[PDB]
């Protein structure tokens, strides 16, 4: 499952609740073709990697998180461990998404 993040507080709470687990965040827009293409895949990874936490931020519905995270393209994937950012890249690149998970987990 992909947890939808609706507020700054909810993000932070998710990062805290994660403990030591890798957290992967998909920053997405409805108007972004590539994001929509990669959503089923992101969701599939959330089932495959049961000890990784998967979050989705819609950049327009959750614009204050988008601003603070310094998003400019979609999709952007950010990776956190113990509250700290440990990776980030952009683009709907499945291979790279799954590889980065394996590198950071």
Find tokens 């590198």 and name the residue: 103
Structural domain spans, the chain: 1-105
Which residue in 26, 14, 16 sits closest to 71, CA to CA? 26
Look up the CATH number of domain 1-105: 3.40.30.10
Considering the candidates 15, 29, 35, 53, report the single residue annotated as catalytic: 35
Q: Is 62 a catalytic residue?
A: no
Contact criterion met (CB below 8 Å) for 79 and 49: no
Resolution of this model in Å is: 1.0
Per-residue H/E/C for 70-91: CCCCCCEEEEEECCEEEEEEEC
- Coil vs helix vs strand at 4: strand
Question: In angstroms, what CA-CA distances link 3 with 6, 10, 22, 24?
Answer: 9, 10, 14, 11
Contact criterion met (CB below 8 Å) for 83 and 16: yes
Method by which the model was determined: X-ray
Considering the candidates 32, 49, 90, 104, report the single residue annotated as catalytic: 32
Which residue in 88, 93, 7, 84 sits closest to 42, CA to CA? 93
């Amino acid at each position: 499952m992909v947890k939808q993040i609706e507020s700054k507080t909810a993000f932070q709470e998710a990062l805290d609740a994660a403990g030591d687990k890798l957290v992967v965040v998909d920053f997405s827009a409805t108007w972004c073709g590539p994001c929509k293409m990669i959503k089923p895949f992101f969701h599939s990874l959330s089932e495959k990697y049961s000890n990784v936490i998967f979050l989705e931020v819609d950049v327009d519905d959750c614009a204050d998180v988008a601003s603070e995270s310094e998003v400019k393209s979609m999709p952007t994937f950010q990776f956190f461990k113990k509250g700290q950012k440990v990776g980030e890249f952009s683009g709907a690149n499945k291979e790279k998404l799954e590889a980065t998970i394996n590198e950071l987990v």
